[model samples]
Structure formats: C-alpha cells, structure tokens
Target: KKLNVAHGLAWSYYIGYLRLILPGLQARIRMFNQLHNNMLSGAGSRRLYILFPLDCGVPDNLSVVDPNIRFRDMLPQQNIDRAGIKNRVYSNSVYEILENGQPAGVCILEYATPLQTLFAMSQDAKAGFSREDRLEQAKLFCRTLEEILEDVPERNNCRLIVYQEPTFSLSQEVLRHIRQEEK
Candidate 1:
C-alpha cells in the first residue's frame, strides 16, 4: 500500500468476431469496487486504473494531429444487460472513490465503439482492429500510458506498470514494462 495508483490489463470484444483496444466500463467499475473491497476487507492503499475503450476510432497516421486526446465525466447511462429486454435494469452510478484512508486513484480511458458502429464500420476491412493496427495500437498504449505514469512521484516505491491484453495471442507483442524509481 505504498502508492495510490495500481494498474491492470484487460480487453474488449465485439461479440467475438471483433476486438477492441480497451476493456469495458462495467469491468472497470467492478475493478473500482474490487479495489475498495481490498481496502475494506484486506486493508488497501492500492487501487486500479481500468482504461475502458469507449471511442471506436484511431486515425490512420500517428502524428497526424495537433497533440492528442481527451477524457471527462461519466453520467454513464451504462446498461446492465438486456437479455429478455422486458423493462431491463440500467444500474447507473457516479461511483466515485473519495477519502477512505489513503485514497487510491483510477484513470478511466475509453478505447472502443458501439456495437452498431462496429458493424457499420465493418463494410470495409477496417473495424479498427487490424492485425498490424493492433500491433501499433498496442505500442501506442504502452508508450503513451508508460510516459503518463512514469514520472509518478507520489506513488513512492510503487511501480507504474502498463500491460497490453491478449498477453500472448500475438507472437509479435510489443507491450511490456514496469517502471519503478529506485529509492
């Protein structure tokens, strides 16, 4: 329980036929609950950052923009599920973590698109999950997240780690790192 930030790795899929770079928000929300659970049950000073893939696009070029990216509020009308679809529940929340002791922090990043969008963009060979695209996309996440987490000083002794999911589905993986400043 040294640092306030803890990191994790996960994935998102489009009914199995498609893949996305980030995990879903519900999973993160669970992770958030899990973190606090760790504190409530096991005494935690550690928390996780669940980067959910919300957006469904990645530009064709790397440096094709004036700087890069954004993130904000989550009045997230997140659906629970709609199996039968007869007045289903949509458990919403501002599930935020505040002072509980030594507070932990979570950074949520959206990395995917809607189901209809995935199929809409499916007409072409680009639903944003190209083999090589994932290769580069993985690299982009690792590098960008690493840099964003690297200079973390408040996390003393704790490491700023970044991991790409599919852990090894791709034999040519480029994501792997654990940044810890030696004290």
Candidate 2:
C-alpha cells in the first residue's frame, strides 16, 4: 500500500532535494557510506532512525500495533519537479525534549522488516520506550534471528535487493577542492 499523503510528500521532497544537490555517483557514494557508517556502527546507531520517516513514513501513533503498512515513494525526480526543498521536513517522535534529556530529532527506518521487530519490542515493553531502548531492542532482535527462523520455518521468501544509495549535502566546504577536472 502507498504511504499517507503527508509522509509521501515529505519522503518525495527529501529524496528529490538530495537528487538536486548531489548529482553524481561519487558524491552519492560518500554520503551513503557516511550514513551507513553513522547509523550502523560509528555513532552507536544513534542517528539511524532519522532516515525512517523518509523510508516508511511517520505514523500518528508509532507505538500502536498495526500491520497496514504504507510504502514510501521512490520517485525522487517526480517530487522535485512538483515540490521544492522548502516543503520537505520531518516531525520529531519524542514527546518531550529537555535540554539534558534530549534524544535524537526524529526516527526513520529503511527496511520495513525491522518495523515488525520494533513493534514486537514495543508490545513487549508495554510501558513505552525511548531511543536508547530501541538500541537494545535492535540488539536483542539481531541476537534472536535463529529463534525466529526456528519458530517459523515456512516463511522463507526472497527478492532481488534493490539498493538505494544516499546523496551528500553540498554544504560541505571541502567538497569544492575534491572535485577536480579529468586529466
């Protein structure tokens, strides 16, 4: 199913904005590597959730149990043609952001499969969870993969993985010197 109107628009606009700023593979690769590294390992997976809104679309109540998922729009070019960067923005998931207790701005998950795990963890928690809680949730989910497979052996399914690489922001000052003419 398609994403809700607001999310679809936001996802499209952000993806489109990236396309405009980062036009080549080299720049795109660098950003992808940075994002992967930051979200996966470098920063202790702290910023990984920011991309989720763009990937899966934000829900009114993320803590609720619902499988009627919405798919994000992959058409960045079309969105760019229609809406500009000014219209693309995301909402923060946290209810309160104290100066000391402030967590990440917002969360966005790339793969939909992970959301199942997240929802499961939330159900298990019962009393709600924080960003830090998700880190542990992710770790526990990774550890119990074998148990999941054992519990449901007949769920095997496969599809060709279509990779979507990220594009870098031109706000970097050092990027200009890095781009050189071909000899």
Candidate 3:
C-alpha cells in the first residue's frame, strides 16, 4: 500500500506537468496546421490587430519604435527560472488610433506564427507556473486578459481586428498607407 501510494503521487505529478504544458503545445500545433492549410491554399501570412479606446492620453514615455515596450514594461516583474528558455513569439507594433484625423487612443498590430504565440506565452514570467497548481496558467493568462478588457475603467470601447493578407508579400508600409487613405 505504501509503494502504491508513492506511485500514485508520481503519476499525479506527471499528469499535472502534462496539463501545464498541453495548452501551449496545442496552440502551437494549431498555428502550424493553419499555416500548412494556408500554404496549400496559396494564402499569404495573417495578422491580428487589437484596438481599445483609452480614456486617457498616450503615455509620454511610450516608445514609438516598439509599441509593446510600454505594455511589456507595465507587466509585473517575476523571477525567471534559470533553466527555462525565453522566446519572442510575436512581432508587434503600436499605432495611433485616429478619429477624424486626431489621435484617439492606440492600437496594437501583432504579427506572429502560432508557435511563436505559444512560446511567448510560456516565457511570460507573470503568467508562468510550475506543475500541480489548481489552475492552468495559460488559461488563467487568457482569462486575465478577458477580465481586464471587460472590467478596466480606462477602456471605453474594445475591439479586435484581424487582417489576413492573401499575398504574403504585402508590406506594413503598404498596409499603413492603405489605412491612411481610407481615413
């Protein structure tokens, strides 16, 4: 009975590790699958944009070159495990949200592979957790974002915009120009 109990504990730990890692693995797989399908269909790369209305003005210290700088900086610091690998799964930029030719707020344009997103999430220290926790850290990360969007007082209107360019060759400059022309 004593040996059986120990074995059960070990198995439980193993299952916990699997649960901790599965979400990211599944996301990475889905991203690859989508990319494969897109390739077969002669489709180009895809992009995702998140837009939210800020009740306040843009921060003066925000970096125009890297819009995520402010957002990343705002994230609470965490102690990184030395053995863990860090990965940047997404390339992103921040744009001014214009309303009648005036700056309204900010928007985030993220370009990434599915694998990258998963890797990025795993590397986030604030959301990272060891196995055996009651809550799945990845799901919690997502839930936290959802709750922020729903509950934040500063965010008046939140929206998501996705752009899938049929031609992978389309540059960011061209997209920006097109958006400008539409405004």
Candidate 4:
C-alpha cells in the first residue's frame, strides 16, 4: 500500500542521504523493501511520502572537481545487533514529490544507523527497562520523529524543498492525487 502511494511524490535533493552504502544492490533493494514492509506492519503509526526524482543536469566545466570523490565514499559501515537491525530494516525511504507540474519536495525515509541505534539503546539502558519505561522511551522516539518532520518547508519559490516530517501520508488518497496530476 505504501509502495503504491509513494509512486509519485515530490521530493528535493536534500531529502536523501546521497550515495549512502548498503554494501550491494541487493542490500539496497532489501532496505527499500524493509521500509515498505514497515509501513504495512506499523499501519496507523507509519508515515509515507511522495518522492520526486531530481536531476541536477550537466554541470559546468568550471565547477570544482575532486578526483578522489566517489559515490560510496560518504557511507561507512557500522554493525548493528539483531533488534537494532530490525528497527533499521524497516525504516527509511527516499522520495521525491512533485507539485504544480514540477519537482518540489524531497522526503527521506528515516533509518537509524548502527551508531545511532547504539546511542538510542544507551539511553534506554541507563534508565533500566520496565514495561512503562519501554513505553516511555518508545513515545519519546515517536515524538522525535514528529519534530523532525515538522521542520520541512511547504515550498520554496518553485525550487526543491527539504522536509523532515511529512505533513501528509502517502496513502491511497495521495496516490489518487498523483494519478490525477501525473504527466
């Protein structure tokens, strides 16, 4: 369901982690699948986005060039444990949402890196877990996500915009919206 809705969403360049590595193309595809799976499993708690693909177009010859720069250079591997891996397995998506017949917004799915998972686990560990403690931490995490999304801008003078939190779910209704306006 989430997959279908995200088929045509507006997104901006800043929305995705450029050239982030997942080791292999199969792993990358798995990551994307995990995100969609999470959306399906989490239902009401899950959020989705409309993605807009961007093309910066050919750069001018005068632009700064770095011979050592490579697509995978920015990503580093960090090991995550089973549970942490599970959380990351089903989070994160790269989306580009279009508006007014043009590319407009970038919505990045949130996936926790191994380091971040460790940090989050550390916080939970310090408090010691009881049922309520777990719930409280979970609530806090959800609130953090909402805060992030709230920071995204609506539009910016017909240019690409980055949104942290999506204002709308890429639900079936959003799919309808896309189809109605699709080029």
Which one is best on lDDT? 3
lDDT tens per residue, model 2, 33-142: 46544322222112212222211223224333222222222111221233344544322221111122332212122333454445555556567666456544444433
- Residue pairs clashing, model 1: 39-44, 53-111, 53-112, 54-110, 54-111, 54-112, 55-112
Best by TM-score, which number?
Answer: 1
lDDT of 2 at 48: 19
Q: Flag regions of model 1 displaced more than 4 Å.
A: 1-45, 51-129, 155-183
Cα deviation of 138 in candidate 1 (Å)?
2.4
After TM-score superposition, the amount by which residue 59's alpha carbon in candidate 3 deviates from its true location, in angstroms, is: 28
Q: In model 4, state the lDDT of residue 52.
A: 21
How much is the lDDT of residue 102 in candidate 1?
22
Worst 10 residues of 4 by lDDT: 53-62
lDDT of 2: 0.30
Candidate 1, residues 1-183: lDDT per residue as tens digits?
Answer: 532111112122222211111124335355544644432221111222232221323421212311121122332333333333334333222212222332232223222223233334334664445444444443444444445434543322122233344423111111111112112
Error of 1 at 164 (Å): 6.7
The per-candidate count of clashes, in order, stands at 7, 6, 1, 21
- Between prediction 1 and prediction 3, which has the larger lDDT? 3
What is the lDDT for 113 in model 1? 25
Per-residue alpha-carbon lDDT of candidate 3 for residues 1-183, written as tens digits (9 for 90 to 100) = 423322333234223322233223323334444644422111111212332111111212324523322232111112222224343232333344344444433333332122233344445689643432312332333333445445533322222322332432122432353354322
Report the C-alpha lDDT of model 4 over 1-183, residue by residue, as the tens digit. 532111111111123321122223234343444644432222211232322211111111111221121111111133333421332322334343345544333323222222233234435756544534433433444444334444543311011112122323232223343334333
Deviation in Å, model 2, residue 68 alpha carbon: 24
